[PDB]
């Protein structure tokens, strides 16, 4: 083994040295060079480390690595072979085999005058295969942020002219101003005149350099690339449903035809109860006090229980508690509580054009969208600074953004967190205004930094001539997707919108601090609303917009319903007693039910919004049945009055009917104890139902009687009219309603198929105020970013190997997410992840860093490591040490010094084994619809299952958690399918069982009433999934009420028809329905007559425009079916 040089001699040019000629054997490297050799040329680091280089040469090699690193650092395999080319030249103990000195000159030591010899030039015999592999591993590497190949910057020519041998030739030519002296390469896989070319093994860009150094990326490599995604599923059925409906229709038609052809070819208990009731009445018919006294008692119980009208309604608790939805939210809290909320603005520049700007030294045309005009950025910065300076007052105190913001690096840094493109310029007008240029070029400006910072937002030093940091003033990177909108692919320069985001404390556990934050928010909303700049359109996130709009909009419409309620109760008042006899009752009846309900609920605590539309419209049941019992008696007139004339007309039609009506109602509201977020309003009303029932018992009858004994004339006429109507109805049924009845069946059939073959969750569409609209419009337009978090809490974490396995799970999750997409982009996640396992790894290969104590004090630097061999081991496993260091950070360590810390961990003392709870979050955009977010949530749950299902263990111990400002809120829209089927199902049983608690005709009554259950439902669904309909936490309650009123109708028509004393074919039926038809047109008609004022009327928002919309439609359909349904059933019988 022999050298050609050893050590450094004279200056060549600049700061550059020739090496000293030396032709002896290699020399063991001093221990003081072991770090350098381990770092640069670890292949030589064994035995006596006998090399043809000294420590000075290795230091010089390290110092010269800056420019290759500048362009190749991202692809370790590419850089590795290059380093080996230089290591072999500099240090190989067999230099003489592949190097031949070709020029020299004297070196004279200035002090001793001893002569040595500069190696001025030499020839280097490089393997052909080595050179080609070195080029091959680097040829796809892309410059840090640039569609140009890194080799175009290291080859003295463009990348399309760069080849393996001319690249090496260029690097080795002193003319390049970097190489200290020229090395002339000769490329051969064969010996050349006894020289044995350097042909060291090489690594491709698809290979790992070592155990702690991964292969190169796709973006910077070719070998390790592909394949894209191919898991797209395409479903689409439905026609089947249509065919079935059609088939059914055909069958029906056939049946009808057949029928036509044929015609051409040819109880005790109940009674007893009634009797008892009558007896009671007769007794009661001997005193008014008792009754009223009872009403008075109810006046108290109702009002009494209403003590402390604390009937809350806020804030966002309707998904109900318990289960996973709530339990999951609570869990994430104990670990961190409320991650926090964001006030967010989207900003566009409608009066500004795009523009071009060549960035040195490429000079390629890069277009920049309207909002990235330099002047609009300055204007957006002024907006931003003004927002930071907003103050609100609460009590006598002042509230700033600095009091409520996420300031991640407090106290050492109170700097608030503002996600904005302006934070790439540290929110500084001057810094952004800067621009290093001369008479010839602009070398660096607000463009270069931008194009660099979108690729390296954590950088504390632009690689351009500006040398400005990218890191935001809050101490963390601002990711480009989260601050720009309306750009294509990752061409952030083409953005048509800026997004500005301020995280502020939600203060879920602190009431006094939350109120202060909400005071600030109100000022923020005001500031934005009144901000004047023709150059910018600014639009909303906040908090009140969604909470203030609902409480600010939902009011005017009140006057609508209120009015309608009055005009309706007026008619129902005129109807029967007309005068001041019936009015009193009702007013008391409606009050009793409403008052009683509030009292029944006060004994358990509860409250709600829709709980009002139900309470009011629900009261109808009490009025309807109550409005027909009195009317029927009015139509009475025999040998008796008051005495038996009241018990024979009351305990005869009111006993059974009412008795059955009250039950069918209590069964729908009573058994409302189910599982969901509506049982409260439900039960409360159902309870108010028996109450309202027992009320109108002796109260209405007695009162109506006690007092019942121009106005008279009017009553008679109405009665007469009713009678006439009944007669007409009878006549109609007499003819033949078989054809139309079949047609009706068709309508129901078509409805079931059209209603069962549509569906939907529920979106958010509030009135057109302003704020809310802006946020809704901005969201629709924007895209790519704006977020929620998927999040896991994990336990244990102590077995180096289980951490490696958990990291593989984590990396795999990042992949699927960055893949799963839809239409023209991903849907699932976003997405990507920054747990921490990578931070630790980075440190192992990094250095220390400075911490500067606040306000003053000497600098503190402290740390260490642990390479080379150990380095790989340390990073591989163990974790207490790393963990306790990694949690305490706030100043990088290498070429700069910034902040790169976080949170989520919280062990005790130095028990690193007890660490919790690491949390990884990938924010994904959506804002599509109630069904869109629900679909994404559905995917995330399966994602959580897949990760937890992959590698589990013992029983239970934490799992996946998808907490996104949309869950708990949409969590309900999840089990909506089972709810509807379960909710209605529970009523179908309570109704079929109740209607039998005083009958049990097997198929007679059972089917009669049972048919009404599916009869009306198909209508509600049709209108909902058919025309102007909807569905949600309310619609579900809507369907419930529907089945309720429906039961009411049927109940009366049927309890008196089924029996039928003097029985017949279809004659007795027409007789009963007659006395029941008059009431069907009274309450029903009126009720509709009221909705119209509510439905046919107007409003200032679609909100109720639907709620009270279907009501009238669904309520109307049910009423119509009442008469038809009964008639059809009778005929069938």
């Amino acid at each position: 083994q022999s050298c050609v040089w050893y050590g450094e001699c004279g200056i060549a040019y600049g700061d550059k040295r020739y090496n000293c000629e030396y032709s002896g054997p290699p020399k063991p490297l001093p221990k003081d060079g072991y770090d350098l050799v381990q770092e640069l040329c670890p292949g030589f680091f064994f035995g006596n480390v006998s090399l043809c280089c000294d420590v000075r040469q290795l230091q010089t090699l390290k110092d010269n690595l800056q420019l290759p690193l500048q362009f190749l650092s991202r692809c370790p395999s590419c850089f590795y072979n290059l380093l080996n080319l230089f290591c072999e030249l500099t240090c190989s103990p067999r230099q003489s085999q592949f190097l031949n000195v070709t020029a020299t000159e004297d070196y004279v030591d200035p002090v001793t005058n001893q002569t040595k010899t500069n190696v001025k030039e030499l020839q280097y015999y490089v393997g052909q295969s080595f050179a080609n592999a070195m080029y091959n591993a680097c040829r796809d590497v892309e410059a840090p942020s640039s569609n140009d190949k890194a080799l175009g910057l290291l080859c003295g020519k463009d990348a399309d002219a760069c080849n393996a041998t001319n690249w090496i030739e260029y690097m080795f030519n002193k003319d390049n101003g970097q190489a200290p002296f020229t090395i002339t390469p000769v490329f051969s896989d064969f010996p050349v005149h006894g020289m044995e070319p350097m042909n060291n093994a090489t690594k491709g860009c698809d290979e790992s350099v070592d155990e702690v150094t991964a292969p190169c990326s796709c973006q910077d490599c070719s070998i390790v690339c592909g394949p894209k995604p191919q898991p797209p599923p395409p479903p689409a059925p439905w026609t089947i449903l249509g065919l079935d409906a059609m088939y059914v229709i055909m069958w029906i038609t056939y049946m009808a035809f057949l029928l036509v052809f044929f015609g051409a070819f040819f109880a005790f208990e109940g009674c007893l109860r009634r009797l008892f009731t009558r007896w009671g009445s007769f007794c009661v018919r001997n005193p008014g006090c008792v009754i009223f006294f009872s009403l008075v008692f109810i006046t108290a119980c109702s009002s009494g229980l209403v003590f402390v009208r604390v009937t809350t309604n806020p804030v966002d608790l309707w998904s109900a508690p318990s289960s996973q939805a709530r339990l999951e939210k609570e869990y994430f809290d104990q670990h961190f509580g409320p991650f926090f909320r964001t006030e967010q603005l989207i900003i566009r520049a409608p009066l500004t054009d795009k523009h071009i700007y060549q960035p040195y030294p490429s000079g390629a045309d890069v277009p920049f969208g309207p909002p990235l005009d330099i002047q609009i950025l300055h204007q957006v910065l002024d907006l931003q600074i003004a927002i930071e300076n907003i103050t609100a007052s609460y009590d006598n105190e002042t509230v700033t953004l600095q009091d409520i913001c996420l300031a991640p690096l407090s106290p050492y840094n109170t700097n608030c967190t503002i996600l904005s493109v302006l934070n790439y310029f540290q929110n500084s007008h001057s810094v952004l205004d800067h621009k290093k240029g001369d008479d010839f070029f602009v070398y660096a400006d607000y463009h270069t930094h931008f194009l660099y910072c979108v690729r390296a937002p954590a950088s504390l030093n632009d690689t351009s001539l500006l040398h400005d940091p990218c890191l935001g003033t809050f101490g963390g990177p601002v990711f480009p997707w989260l601050v720009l909108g309306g750009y294509d692919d990752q061409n952030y320069n083409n953005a048509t919108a800026l997004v500005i985001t301020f995280p502020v404390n939600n203060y879920y556990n602190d009431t006094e601090k939350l109120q202060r934050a909400q005071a600030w928010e109100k000022e923020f909303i005001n500031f934005v609303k009144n901000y004047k700049n023709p150059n910018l359109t600014i639009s909303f996130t906040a908090e009140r917009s969604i909470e203030d709009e609902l409480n600010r909009e939902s009011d005017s419409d009140v006057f609508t319903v209120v009015i309608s309620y009055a005009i309706m109760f007026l008619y129902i008042s005129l109807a029967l007693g007309h005068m001041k006899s019936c009015r009193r009752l009702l007013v008391d009846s409606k009050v009793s039910l409403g008052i009683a309900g509030i009292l029944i609920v006060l004994s358990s605590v509860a409250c709600s919004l829709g709980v009002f539309s139900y309470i009011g419209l629900p009261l109808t049941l009490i009025v309807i049945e109550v409005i027909p019992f009195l009317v029927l008696a009015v139509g009475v007139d025999n040998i008796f009055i008051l005495v038996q004339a009241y018990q024979r007309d009351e305990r005869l039609q009111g006993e059974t009917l009412d008795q059955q009506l009250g039950r069918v109602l209590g069964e729908v509201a009573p058994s409302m104890f189910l599982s969901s977020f509506s049982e409260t309003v439900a039960f409360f009303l159902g309870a108010l139902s028996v109450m309202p029932a027992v009320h109108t018992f002796s109260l209405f009858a007695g009162l109506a009687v006690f007092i019942d004994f121009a106005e008279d004339g009017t009553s008679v006429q109405a009665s007469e009219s009713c009678l006439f109507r009944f007669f007409k109805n009878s006549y109609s049924p007499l003819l033949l309603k078989d054809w139309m009845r079949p047609i009706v069946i068709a309508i129901f059939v078509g409805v079931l198929s059209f209603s069962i073959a549509v569906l939907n969750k529920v979106d958010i569409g509030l009135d057109q105020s302003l704020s809310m609209p802006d946020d809704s419009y901005m969201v629709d337009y924007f895209k790519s970013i704006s977020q929620y978090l998927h999040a896991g809490p994990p336990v244990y974490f102590v077995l180096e190997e289980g951490h490696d396995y958990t990291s593989s799970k984590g990396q795999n999750m990042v992949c699927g997410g960055m893949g799963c997409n839809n239409d023209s982009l991903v849907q699932q996640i976003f997405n990507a992840a920054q747990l921490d396992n990578y931070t630790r790894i980075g440190f192992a290969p990094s250095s220390w860093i400075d911490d500067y104590f606040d306000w003053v004090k000497p600098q503190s630097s402290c740390c260490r490591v642990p390479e080379g061999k150990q380095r790989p081991q340390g990073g591989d496993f163990m974790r207490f040490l790393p963990m306790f260091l990694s949690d305490n950070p706030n100043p990088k360590c290498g070429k700069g010094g910034h902040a790169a810390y976080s949170s989520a961990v919280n062990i005790l003392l130095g028990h690193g084994t007890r660490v919790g709870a690491t949390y990884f979050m990938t924010y994904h955009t959506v804002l599509q619809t109630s069904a869109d977010f629900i679909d994404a949530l559905k995917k995330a749950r399966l994602i959580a299952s897949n990760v937890t299902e992959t590698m589990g263990i013992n029983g239970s111990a934490y799992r996946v958690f998808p907490y996104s400002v949309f869950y708990v809120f949409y969590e309900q829209y999840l089990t909506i399918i089972d709810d509807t089927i379960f909710n209605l199902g529970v009523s179908l049983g309570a109704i079929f069982l109740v209607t039998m608690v005083l009958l049990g005709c097997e198929l007679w009554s059972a089917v009669i009433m049972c048919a009404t259950i599916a009869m009306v439902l198909v209508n509600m669904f049709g209108v909902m999934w058919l025309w102007g309909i909807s569905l949600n936490a309310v619609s579900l309650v809507n369907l419930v009420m529907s089945c309720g009123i429906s039961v009411e109708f049927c109940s009366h028509i049927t309890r008196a028809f089924t029996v039928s004393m003097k029985g017949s074919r279809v004659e007795r039926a027409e007789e009963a329905l007659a006395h029941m038809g008059s009431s069907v047109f009274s309450g029903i008609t009126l009720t509709k007559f009221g909705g119209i004022v509510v439905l046919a009327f107007a409003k200032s928002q679609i909100f109720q425009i639907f709620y009270f919309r279907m009501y009238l439609a669904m309520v109307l359909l049910g009423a119509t079916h009442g008469l038809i349904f009964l008639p059809v059933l009778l005929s069938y019988i």
């Binding site: 003295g156 071009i356 700007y357 060549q358 960035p359 040195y360 030294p361 000079g363 001369d438 008479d439 010839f440 070029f441 602009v442 070398y443």
Partner: protein, 158 residues
């Protein structure tokens, strides 16, 4: 107010003119007259474009001028500029017909972008010429390789 003329014997370079050309000095053919372009590069001269532009500047009201030269030297550094005004139109004039790039460059700084362009033409602040292919101009032409230089006129031996 007179252009110097260099007279060479074997190696005697005497800066004379016909305001001296001794009655023993022999000019027998016009083929003895040559103009030469020499390059301004080397130590001190900004070899990098940011330093090089400092020697050039934009000026209006001065018409460009061209003069031929018949021989020059290999240049280590040449320049080739393309510049858009802020409004996107062209800042440097197109090379006039018959004006081609300097023919012998080791390396060309070939660059393109946008700049303020605060004048009609780009000149040399030191009063030198932009040397193209055997034509020297007072001005920079668009996308056309030049070396910086100066011209001399000589009388060569028979």
């Amino acid at each position: 107010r007179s252009i110097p003329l260099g007279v060479i014997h074997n190696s005697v370079l005497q800066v004379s003119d016909v305001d001296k050309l001794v009655c023993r000095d022999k000019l027998s053919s016009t083929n003895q007259l040559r103009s030469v372009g020499l390059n301004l590069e080397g130590n001190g001269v900004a070899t990098d474009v940011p330093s090089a532009t400092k020697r050039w500047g934009f000026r209006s009201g001065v018409p460009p001028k061209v003069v031929n030269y018949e021989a020059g030297e290999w240049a280590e550094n040449c320049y080739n500029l393309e510049i858009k005004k802020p409004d996107g139109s062209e800042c440097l004039p197109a090379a006039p017909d018959g004006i081609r790039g300097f023919p012998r460059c080791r390396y060309v700084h070939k660059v393109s972008g946008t700049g303020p362009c605060a004048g009609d033409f780009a000149f040399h602040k030191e009063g030198a010429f932009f040397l193209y292919d055997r034509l020297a101009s007072t001005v920079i032409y668009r996308g056309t390789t030049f070396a910086e230089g100066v011209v001399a006129f000589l009388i060569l031996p028979q």
